[PDB]
Design a protein around this ligand. Structure first.
Ligand SMILES: Nc1ncnc2c1ncn2[C@@H]1O[C@H](COP(=O)(O)OP(=O)(O)OP(=O)(O)O)[C@@H](O)[C@H]1O
Ligand SMILES: [Ca+2]
Ligand SMILES: [Ca+2]
Ligand SMILES: [Ca+2]
Ligand SMILES: [Ca+2]
Ligand SMILES: [Ca+2]
Lengths: 347, 365
């Protein structure tokens, strides 16, 4: 608590730790002096003072090739160690090839630098980056639903709408024979992806036959003659009505039950209740959603997650099926589309 | 599972938000809440807000408020929804499942930190949280425990001498001059030239011009003379609706304000003077290390040349033999956040969380 802090430093001597993936790991004892240039270390020296208590010196050493997390951690570990020694230790920053004379005098043979070291702890991100290229068919008679299809002109027809999502840019495209309800849904979902999925950091471009932009053609290739299409039948509508099922994971009644709430679309928003988790299985399209209620307990959450991902293999869904997990209030458009009249809480 | 910590760095102009153990914040968005504009007499009790980048995108039909002023939270209602938007939209996570690290302005009043903590536990239900001083994290990021930081953002600039891990509070220096001001001044300066930069829309184009073509002159009055000799130093810039505008000495006159706050009518000492003054408020025995570890932080320190200026200016102010170093890390827009990501990932930090239970047993603390 922490085990390495407990060991340090209780008597005269020299201790050396290497920073490894956010941790303080003691250096093999006959390796003291060997220093990896890709790495960062912390060194405590303890001297016996003739008055009974001890003098501490903390030196954190930084190789010319060490990653920022390691040098940052090395530094912070130094202060946490000094604090644990009631601020009674003197901190020295030691840069490779510029080490303090006092530091050098801790090693009777002199340091030996070593190429390489342990991989950085950082996962790497570029802020606000999104890499997305996907295509949607927005289709229905009166019950329009968005469903994913290959990124090619072959998916297109002059009778439905399509959302070509490229990250910062969303192409909403409707064919001339697309009915009134498909148009609203195209717009609803496009704005959803932009404002909600991309936090407003995206631009929607509306298009149709003969207006489609450079960047759309850049992906899809040169526009061929598009088919059709057949009008939407009330029978196709009732199919969209059965596209997804809605389960409730709860143990509120003493035991873990996964109940089927609804198999008919659109679901009632009211059905998603905060004390529990829910799964919206749209697995055929490769999408299962795990809705965590803010008051659902931790076991309910792990179960929902487990159940959701069992479905992929139980129902032989086409992996790479994506299980997205949604916090209450953090719901996404491709999941909000299955509800009757979504009401945005704070409005 | 196993649980990841959230690091969220709330600043006057921008929220830098993400998961501990990353290089960088995953989400970086304007620190603004916008409601739909209304004109005149008042009738009702209202409705919806928009937060962050969606507010930028929708500004043409809304009025934008800033929850953080000069690095301090002053609007709790709107700060609540800046956090809501971070948790549920930008990171898209359940806050109840992640320990959360938050940053604060240096000298942040006790009552601010206590409200912040209250809101996290009582409205957001986080399992644990910790508050870190912005500047201190930045120092850690560069792998130092001793040094003096210049943090300068959109709304505030600070000088924070730090020794052996902790800031020396009486030597801390706060100057209410940062990005927004510089941006406002560039708007002014360009308008005097003969362009039209007044509207808040135009304030966004100028921010871009500011951050793309401005630099700090190594020597101001020399550069003025270069600018009056040739077009050599001039840059061109294209407006969306436009059309091209020419920019000249305003390129360097704008950031100059940091060293000469009278450019905008401020009685204050310049950032070089406030640095020196800060070092001088410290124990004589530690000044030597303060001078050799000037670490730079915040988007407003990004100006090309600023490091060489700090160097020239500080050299001038200090004892003749004093070793002076200016450290300007390439990724300094995010030093504060990186500092947090590293601290929150450490094996030993687990001990430092204020847990929910511990909260429900004392007056924040
Ligand atoms: N290359 C650049 N040149 C000049 N200024 C820049 C550059 N990049 C970003 N900025 C400025 O940095 C500011 C944002 O920086 P930062 O995120 O550190 O501030 P903040 O934390 O939001 O505010 P504060 O620290 O003042 O509370 C903006 O004013 C922006 O114009
Ligand atoms: Ca390493
Ligand atoms: Ca000490
Ligand atoms: Ca159709
Ligand atoms: Ca429950
Ligand atoms: Ca800041």
């Amino acid at each position: 608590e922490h085990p390495e802090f407990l060991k340090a430093g209780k008597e005269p001597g020299l201790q050396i730790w290497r920073v490894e993936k956010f941790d303080l790991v003691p250096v093999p004892t006959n390796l003291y002096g060997d220093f990896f240039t890709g790495d960062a270390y912390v060194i405590l020296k303890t001297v016996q003072l003739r008055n009974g208590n001890l003098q501490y010196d903390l030196h954190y050493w930084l190789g010319n090739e060490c990653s920022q997390d390691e040098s940052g951690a090395a530094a912070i570990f130094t202060v946490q160690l000094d604090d644990y020694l009631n601020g009674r230790a003197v901190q020295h920053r030691e840069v490779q090839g510029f080490e303090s004379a006092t530091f050098l005098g801790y090693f009777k043979s002199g340091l030996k630098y070593k190429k390489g070291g342990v991989a950085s702890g950082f996962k790497h991100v570029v802020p606000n980056e999104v890499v997305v290229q996907r295509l949607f068919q927005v289709k229905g008679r009166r019950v329009v639903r968005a469903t994913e299809v290959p990124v090619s002109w072959e998916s297109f027809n002059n009778g439905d709408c399509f959302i070509l999502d490229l990250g910062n840019n969303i192409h909403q495209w409707c064919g001339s024979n697309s009915n009134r309800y498909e148009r609203l849904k195209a717009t609803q979902v496009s704005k959803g992806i932009r404002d909600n999925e991309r936090s407003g950091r995206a631009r929607v471009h509306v298009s149709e036959e003969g207006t489609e932009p450079e960047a759309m053609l850049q992906v899809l290739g040169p526009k061929p003659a598009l088919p059709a299409g057949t009008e939407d039948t009330a029978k196709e509508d009732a199919a969209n009505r059965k596209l997804a099922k809605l389960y409730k994971v709860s143990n509120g009644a003493g035991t873990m039950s996964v109940s089927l709430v609804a198999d008919e679309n659109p679901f009632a928003q009211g059905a998603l209740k905060s004390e529990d988790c829910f799964i919206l299985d749209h697995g055929k399209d490769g999408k299962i959603f795990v809705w965590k209620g803010k008051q659902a307990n931790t076991e309910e959450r792990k179960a929902a997650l487990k159940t959701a991902s069992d479905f992929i293999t139980k129902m032989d869904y086409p992996k790479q099926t994506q299980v997205s997990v949604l916090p209450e209030g953090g719901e996404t458009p491709l999941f909000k589309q299955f509800f009757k009249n979504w009401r945005d809480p704070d409005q | 599972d196993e649980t990841t910590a959230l690091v969220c760095d709330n600043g006057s102009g921008l929220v830098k938000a993400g998961f501990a153990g990353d290089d960088a914040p995953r989400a970086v968005f304007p620190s603004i809440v916008g409601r739909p504009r209304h004109q005149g007499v008042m009738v009702g009790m209202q409705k919806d807000s928009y937060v962050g980048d969606e507010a930028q995108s929708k500004r043409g039909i809304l009025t934008l408020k800033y929850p953080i002023e000069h690095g301090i939270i002053t609007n709790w209602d709107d700060m609540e929804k800046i956090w809501h938007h971070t948790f549920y939209n930008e990171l898209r996570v359940a806050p109840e499942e992640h320990p959360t690290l938050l940053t604060e302005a240096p000298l942040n009043p006790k009552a601010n930190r206590e409200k912040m903590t209250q809101i996290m536990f009582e409205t957001f239900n986080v399992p644990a949280m910790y508050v870190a001083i912005q500047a201190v994290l930045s120092l850690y990021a560069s792998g130092r425990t001793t040094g003096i930081v210049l943090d300068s953002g959109d709304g505030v600039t600070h000088n924070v001498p730090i020794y052996e891990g902790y800031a020396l509070p009486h030597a801390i220096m706060r100057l209410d001059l940062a990005g927004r001001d510089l941006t406002d001044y560039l708007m002014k300066i360009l308008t005097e030239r003969g362009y039209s930069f007044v509207t808040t829309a135009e304030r966004e184009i100028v921010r871009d011009i500011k951050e793309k073509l401005c630099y700090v002159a190594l020597d101001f009055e020399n550069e003025m003379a270069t600018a009056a000799s040739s077009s050599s130093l001039e840059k061109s810039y294209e407006l969306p609706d436009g059309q091209v505008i020419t920019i000249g000495n305003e390129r360097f006159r704008c950031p100059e304000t940091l060293f000469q706050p009278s450019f905008i009518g401020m009685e204050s000492a310049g950032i070089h003077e406030t640095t020196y003054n800060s070092i001088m408020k410290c124990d004589i025995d530690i000044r030597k290390d303060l001078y050799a570890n000037n670490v730079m932080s915040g988007g407003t320190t990004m100006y090309p040349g600023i490091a060489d200026r700090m160097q020239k200016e500080i050299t001038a102010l200090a004892p003749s033999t004093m070793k002076i170093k200016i450290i300007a890390p390439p990724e300094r827009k995010y030093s504060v956040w990186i500092g947090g990501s590293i601290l929150a990932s450490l094996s030993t930090f687990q001990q430092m969380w204020i847990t929910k239970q511990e909260y429900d047993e004392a007056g924040p603390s």
